[PDB]
Design a binder for this molecule. Structure first.
Ligand SMILES: Nc1ncnc2c1ncn2[C@@H]1O[C@H](COP(=O)(O)OP(=O)(O)O)[C@@H](O)[C@H]1O
Ligand SMILES: OC[C@H]1O[C@@H](O)[C@H](O)[C@@H](O)[C@@H]1O
Ligand SMILES: [Mg+2]
Length: 1039
C-alpha cells in the first residue's frame, strides 16, 4: 500500500517531508517592515499584549506595536505545510501565502482551502500523474489522501453515483495559471476510473484536435487557449463513461489575421507547414511560414521545446481516432492552406479609386485548394454586389475595404471551420441519452488589459456570472448548515452584490450595454461615436457601476467584481454584426469541396439565427450561450479549482510575493474564507471540542458521556461571551475569532503545565496530577509513591505522624508542601486545601477529617488533599484503602496502582505480626519481583513481645529490598484519649529509638523524621529519573 509506505513515490512527491513548541510560550506575527510594501512580510515575535493591541520585535531589531484587529498572527510552525488550510487558527493573507510557499518549495502544488482546491503552476514536470497515481486515489476520500486534482475528481465522481446528481468542476485562473493542464487531468482520471476502450480513446483524443486549432503561443502562455470550453463527460446509470460533448466559447478569430510581436498564430498553421508530406505540400501549394503574411509579422514562427512537425503527426493521429475520414482531413488542411493563401493576396490602387489585383498567384492557390472559381472570388472581394432597391449594383471597393473584406472572409472561414470540428467531435462522442454527467469548465478568468474591447466585455461579463454563481453557492451551503444544525442566523444573499454589474451589461429594462449596442447596431447611420454617446447618455452619473472618463472620448468604465475596466468602443458595431459580403457567401456555397460547402450551408454553422429566426447580433448570441451554460451549471453540484501562476516569467521554483498575493485577492480564495466571517464560520462536533479543550476546565473528562454539557462547562469556566457562540444539534458554533482565542488558551495552558518538566519537581508532578488524575485514572503514568497496608497496619497513623497532626477518619492523594520560615522570622500557620473546594482554606484540621468523611459518603475517584505546613517536608503520597464484595474492588484498585513501574510502593506492616505470610509485601513482591521499587515500613515495634526483636528485617535480611526498611512507633489508644498529640509523641519516638538496647545503633535511620526525609528523597530522584520518559508521554497525549 503506497499510501503508508514512506519509500513510495506517493510520499516522495505528494507528502510533506517529516515538545519544543509545547513548553514554549512564544507567539509570532506577520508584518511588513515597509508599510508601502504590503506584499513583503517578515516574522516578528510577540513580547507583550494589552487590552486590544500587540507588541512585537521586528527582525530589524525594534519593538513595534499594532492593533489586534489589523494583526496578522502566524500559525504554529507545526502547521507549516498542512494539506488543508481550512484548519488554521489564522487565515490572514500572509498566513495563507506562507503555507502555500512552504508546500510549493517542496514541489507540492496542490493545497485545499475549504471548498476550494488551489493549484500553483510548477512550470516543471512533477511525476504525480502516472497511472499508479491514478490508482492510488481511486475510491479514496479527501481526508484519506493528499491534495490532488485526481482527489477532487474522485469526490465529484463518487458524489455523482451516491447522490445521483450531475457535477461540475470549474477550473479558473489567470492566463497560464494551469487551467487546461488540470482540465486534462480530470478527464484523464475520469476516463480511467470509469473506463483501452474505443470511446475512451476518442474522448481523450478530442482535446488534441481542438488545441491545434484553438490554442496559440501568447506572451503569457506557449499553449494559450484562445477559446473557452465546457466539456461534459457522460455516464450511464452504472457509472461507466458513455460519451462526451463539447461547447466552445469566444474563439479569438482576429488572431488568424493579426498577432502582436513574439506571439504566434494558431498552432495548426505551423503544424501544417512543418508536418505535411511532400505530396500534401504540393497539392496545397505550401511553403515556409516566412512566406505567408499571416505568419511572418510577429517575429516568431516556433516555440522552444515544441516540434510543430511532431505535433502535426499527433493531430493527424487524433483526427483518425476520432473518425474524420481521409478526405475530410484533406479538406480541413485545404481550408487552412487556403486561408494562408488569402492572406498573401495583395490589393493595389487601380487607375481609379477601386482596387485591383495584379498578381493572381495567391488568389489562384487559394481558389484551387478551396474549390471555388478564382474569377468569381476576385470579383466578390473587390466588387461585391449590393442591393439597390430591386437591382444588384457592383460596389467597387478601394484597397483598405477590399483587404478588410478578405480578412472577414478569413475569420469567417476559420470560425466556421472550428465550429465544424466541434460539431463533428460531438457527433461521434455525444449521446442524446445519458443518465448523468460531470462537466468541466475551462475558461479564462477576468481580463483587465490596458486596452479592452468587446471580446473583453464578453469574457468579463462571463466571469461576473461565474463569480455570482460561486458566491451564491457558498451562501446556500452556509444556509443549509445553519438550518440543519438549528443555528439562527440569516445572511443577505452573497450573490446579490453582482446583480448590479450584470444588469448594467445584459439588462433589458432598463436597457444595458448589450441592448444599447444591439439597438445601435441596427440603427441607420450609427457610428462608434453615436454608440459611446448613447452609453454615456444612459449611464453617466446614473449608474454607480458606470463611469464616463475625464478625457478619453472613446472609452467607458465598468466596475467589475475584480475591479474597474475601461473599454474602447472602436469597431464594436462591426464586431456585433460580423458582416461578410453576400457575394462571398455565394462564391463559397458553389465550392466543389464537401466541407467548405458545409461551412456555408449548415445553418447551425453558417449563421447565428437558426432557420426561421430573425436577425441575431453577436452579443445577443453570446448572452444566450452564456445563459444556457449557467442553467446547465445550476443543475449540478459545483466543485471549484483555483489555479495560480507563480510568476510572470514562466519559471519553476520562483514564487513571487506580489504576483501570488494579487491572485489570492481576486481569485476569491481569500473571499471563500471571509464571506461567512459575519456569522459562525467555525463549528465543531461536541465530542471533538471536548476531546481537545477538556484540559481548560476542572472535572471534565476528555471523553465525557454528555459532550454538549461538557462543552458548555468549558466555555463557562473560560467565561466566554455567550453571544460569541451557539449550540447546534451536533456541533458548537463560534463567531469569527472566538475559536482561535480558545486555542490560544489551550496553547498557554499546555506551556504552563509542561515547562516545569525542564529543585521543585514535586510541584510540577502535583500539577499534572491535579489536571489528569482526578477521575481516578493515571494516563501519564505519573511517578508517585503509593502506600499499601492492612486496615490494622496503622498506616494512617504513619501519615498523620508525617503530617504531624491528626486529620484522618477512596484513594487519598496527599500533597504536602513545606513552608519556609516567615520573612520576618515568624512561623506561618499551617492549613489544608481540597481540590474539590477551590476557594476554601481549612485552618482547623478537625474540619479536614470531617470534609473527608463528607465527600466520601469504595470509589476510584481520589480525594485531593493539600497541606501547607512549616512542620512538613515536600512530599506527595497516595494512600489506598487497606486490605468479599468490597475486598475485591480494593485489591483490584491497589493492584491497578502498584502495577505501574513508575510507582514506588510503601509497604506498611505491624511489627507484632511476624514477617512470613505478610500482606502488603506479598502484593508488593507480586508486582515488584526483584524488590527494586518497594520500601517497607515497620510500625508498632514497641508492641512486639518480651524478647521479640526486629533488627533482622530492619537491617534488611529477613527479606532484602533495594530501598530497605524503616522502623517507627505510633501513639497508643490511651495517648489519643489523653492530651498527648502528634509531633509530641515524636519526641518520644526519638528517645525510644535513641535509648533502645538494639535499635540505638540504627536510631539515625528510624523514626518519622527519617522516614519523611527518605520519601522526599526517593520521590525527588524518582521524578528526575522518570522525567525523560514522562516528556514523551505528555507530548503524545497532547497531540
Ligand atoms: N500541473 C502542471 N504540471 C506541469 N506543467 C504545468 C502544470 N500546470 C501548468 N503547467 C505549465 O504551464 C503551461 C501553461 O498551463 P495552461 O494549463 O496551459 O494554463 P491556462 O490554461 O490557465 O492558460 C503549461 O502548458 C505547462 O508548461
Ligand atoms: O435579460 C434577461 C436575462 O437574460 C439572460 O440571458 C441573462 O443571463 C440574465 O442575466 C438576464 O437577466
Ligand atoms: Mg488554457
Amino acid at each position: 500500500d503506497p499510501i503508508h509506505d514512506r519509500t513510495s513515490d506517493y510520499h516522495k512527491y505528494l507528502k510533506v517531508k517529516q515538545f519544543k513548541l509545547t513548553v514554549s510560550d512564544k507567539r509570532y506575527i506577520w508584518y511588513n517592515p515597509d508599510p508601502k510594501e504590503r506584499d513583503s512580510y517578515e516574522c516578528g515575535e510577540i513580547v507583550s499584549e494589552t487590552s486590544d493591541s500587540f507588541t512585537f520585535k521586528t527582525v530589524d531589531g525594534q519593538d513595534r506595536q499594532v492593533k489586534k484587529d489589523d494583526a496578522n498572527q502566524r500559525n504554529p510552525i507545526k502547521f507549516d505545510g498542512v494539506e488543508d488550510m481550512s484548519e488554521l487558527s489564522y487565515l490572514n493573507e500572509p498566513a495563507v501565502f506562507h503555507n502555500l510557499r512552504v508546500r510549493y518549495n517542496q514541489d507540492l502544488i496542490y493545497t485545499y482551502s475549504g471548498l476550494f482546491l488551489v493549484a500553483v503552476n510548477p512550470f516543471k514536470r512533477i511525476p504525480i500523474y502516472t497511472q499508479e497515481m491514478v490508482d492510488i486515489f481511486k475510491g479514496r476520500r479527501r481526508n484519506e489522501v493528499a491534495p490532488h486534482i485526481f482527489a477532487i475528481s474522485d469526490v465529484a465522481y463518487r458524489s455523482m453515483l451516491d447522490d445521483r446528481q450531475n457535477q461540475s468542476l470549474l477550473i479558473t485562473g489567470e492566463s497560464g495559471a494551469g487551467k487546461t493542464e488540470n482540465t486534462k487531468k480530470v478527464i484523464q482520471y475520469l476516463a480511467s476510473v470509469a473506463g483501452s476502450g474505443v470511446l475512451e480513446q476518442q474522448i481523450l483524443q478530442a482535446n488534441p484536435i481542438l488545441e491545434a486549432f484553438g490554442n496559440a503561443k501568447t506572451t503569457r502562455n506557449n499553449n494559450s487557449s484562445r477559446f473557452g470550453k465546457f466539456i461534459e463527460i457522460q455516464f450511464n446509470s452504472a457509472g461507466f463513461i458513455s460519451g462526451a460533448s463539447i461547447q466552445s466559447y469566444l474563439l479569438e478569430k482576429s488572431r488568424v489575421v493579426f498577432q502582436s510581436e513574439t506571439e504566434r498564430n494558431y498552432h495548426i498553421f505551423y503544424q501544417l507547414l512543418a508536418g505535411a508530406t511532400a505530396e500534401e505540400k504540393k497539392a496545397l501549394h505550401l511553403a515556409g511560414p516566412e512566406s505567408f503574411n499571416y505568419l511572418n509579422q510577429s517575429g516568431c514562427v516556433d516555440i522552444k521545446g515544441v516540434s510543430d512537425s511532431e505535433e502535426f503527426k499527433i493531430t493527424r493521429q487524433a483526427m483518425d481516432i476520432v473518425g474524420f475520414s481521409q478526405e475530410e482531413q484533406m479538406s480541413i488542411f485545404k481550408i487552412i492552406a487556403g486561408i494562408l493563401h488569402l492572406g498573401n493576396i495583395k490589393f493595389e490602387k487601380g487607375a481609379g479609386e477601386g482596387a485591383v489585383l495584379k498578381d493572381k498567384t495567391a488568389l489562384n492557390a487559394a481558389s484551387t485548394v478551396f474549390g471555388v472559381n478564382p474569377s468569381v472570388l476576385e470579383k466578390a472581394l473587390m466588387e461585391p454586389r449590393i442591393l439597390a432597391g430591386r437591382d444588384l449594383v457592383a460596389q467597387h471597393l478601394n484597397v483598405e475595404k477590399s483587404s478588410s473584406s478578405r480578412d472577414a472572409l478569413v475569420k469567417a472561414l476559420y470560425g466556421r471551420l472550428f465550429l465544424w470540428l466541434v460539431k463533428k467531435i460531438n457527433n461521434v462522442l455525444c449521446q442524446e441519452r445519458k443518465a448523468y454527467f460531470i462537466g468541466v469548465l475551462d475558461i479564462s478568468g477576468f481580463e483587465i488589459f490596458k486596452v479592452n474591447s468587446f471580446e473583453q466585455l464578453c469574457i468579463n461579463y462571463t466571469n461576473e456570472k461565474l463569480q455570482q454563481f460561486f458566491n451564491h453557492h457558498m451562501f446556500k451551503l452556509e444556509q443549509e448548515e445553519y438550518l440543519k444544525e438549528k443555528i439562527n442566523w440569516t445572511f443577505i444573499d452573497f450573490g446579490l452584490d453582482s446583480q448590479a454589474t450584470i444588469d448594467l451589461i445584459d439588462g433589458r429594462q432598463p436597457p444595458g450595454i448589450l441592448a444599447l449596442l444591439d439597438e445601435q447596431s441596427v440603427f441607420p447611420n450609427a457610428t462608434d461615436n453615436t454608440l459611446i454617446t448613447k452609453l454615456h447618455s444612459h449611464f453617466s452619473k446614473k449608474n454607480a457601476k458606470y463611469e464616463e472618463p475625464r478625457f478619453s472620448k472613446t472609452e467607458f468604465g465598468v466596475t467589475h467584481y475584480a475591479g474597474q475596466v475601461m473599454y474602447e468602443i472602436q469597431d464594436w458595431l462591426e464586431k456585433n454584426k460580423d458582416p461578410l459580403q453576400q457575394d462571398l457567401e455565394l462564391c463559397f456555397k458553389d465550392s466543389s469541396d464537401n466541407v467548405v460547402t458545409k461551412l456555408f450551408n449548415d445553418p447551425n454553422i453558417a449563421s447565428r439565427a437558426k432557420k426561421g429566426a430573425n436577425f441575431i447580433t453577436v452579443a445577443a448570441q453570446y448572452k444566450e450561450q452564456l445563459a444556457s451554460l449557467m442553467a446547465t451549471l445550476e443543475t449540478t453540484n459545483p466543485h471549484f479549482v483555483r489555479c495560480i501562476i507563480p510568476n510572470n516569467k514562466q519559471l519553476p521554483a520562483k514564487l513571487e510575493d506580489k504576483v501570488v498575493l494579487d491572485q489570492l485577492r481576486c481569485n476569491g480564495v481569500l473571499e471563500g474564507i471571509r464571506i461567512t466571517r459575519k456569522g459562525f464560520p467555525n463549528r465543531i462536533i461536541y465530542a471533538d471540542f471536548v476531546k481537545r479543550y477538556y484540559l481548560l476546565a476542572p472535572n471534565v473528562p476528555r471523553d465525557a458521556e454528555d459532550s454538549q454539557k461538557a462543552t458548555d462547562a468549558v466555555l463557562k469556566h473560560l467565561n466566554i461571551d455567550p453571544e460569541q457562540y451557539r449550540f447546534g444539534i451536533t456541533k458548537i458554533f463560534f463567531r469569527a475569532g472566538q475559536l482561535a482565542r480558545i486555542e490560544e488558551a489551550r496553547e498557554q495552558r499546555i506551556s504552563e503545565i509542561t515547562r516545569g518538566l525542564v529543585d521543585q519537581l514535586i510541584p510540577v508532578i502535583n500539577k499534572l496530577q491535579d489536571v489528569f488524575n482526578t477521575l481516578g485514572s493515571d494516563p501519564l503514568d505519573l511517578p508517585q509513591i503509593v502506600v499499601v497496608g492492612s486496615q490494622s497496619s496503622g498506616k494512617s497513623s504513619v501519615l498523620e505522624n508525617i503530617v504531624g497532626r491528626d486529620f484522618l477518619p477512596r484513594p487519598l492523594i496527599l500533597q504536602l508542601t513545606h513552608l519556609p520560615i516567615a520573612d520576618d522570622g515568624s512561623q506561618t500557620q499551617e492549613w489544608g486545601e481540597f481540590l474539590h473546594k477551590p476557594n476554601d482554606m481549612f485552618y482547623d484540621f478537625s474540619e479536614i477529617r470531617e470534609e473527608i468523611i463528607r465527600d466520601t459518603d469504595i470509589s476510584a475517584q481520589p480525594i485531593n488533599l493539600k497541606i501547607y505546613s512549616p512542620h512538613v517536608v515536600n512530599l506527595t503520597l497516595v494512600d489506598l484503602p487497606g486490605i468479599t464484595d468490597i475486598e475485591q474492588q480494593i485489591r483490584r484498585m491497589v493492584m491497578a496502582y502498584i502495577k505501574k513501574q513508575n510507582a514506588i510502593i510503601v509497604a506498611v506492616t505491624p511489627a507484632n505480626t511476624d514477617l512470613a505470610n505478610s500482606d502488603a509485601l506479598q502484593l508488593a513482591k507480586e508486582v515488584d519481583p526483584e524488590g527494586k521499587r518497594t520500601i517497607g515500613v515497620i510500625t508498632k515495634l514497641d508492641l512486639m513481645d518480651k524478647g521479640t526483636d526486629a533488627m533482622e528485617v530492619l537491617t534488611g535480611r529477613v527479606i532484602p529490598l533495594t530501598l530497605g526498611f524503616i522502623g517507627v512507633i505510633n501513639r497508643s489508644q490511651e495517648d489519643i484519649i489523653a492530651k498527648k498529640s502528634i509531633r509530641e509523641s515524636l519526641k518520644s519516638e526519638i528517645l525510644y529509638f535513641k535509648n533502645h538496647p538494639i535499635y540505638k545503633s540504627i536510631a539515625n535511620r528510624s523514626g518519622t523524621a527519617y522516614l519523611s526525609k527518605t520519601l522526599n528523597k526517593l520521590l525527588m530522584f524518582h521524578i528526575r529519573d522518570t522525567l525523560p520518559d514522562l516528556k514523551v508521554k505528555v507530548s503524545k497525549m497532547l497531540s
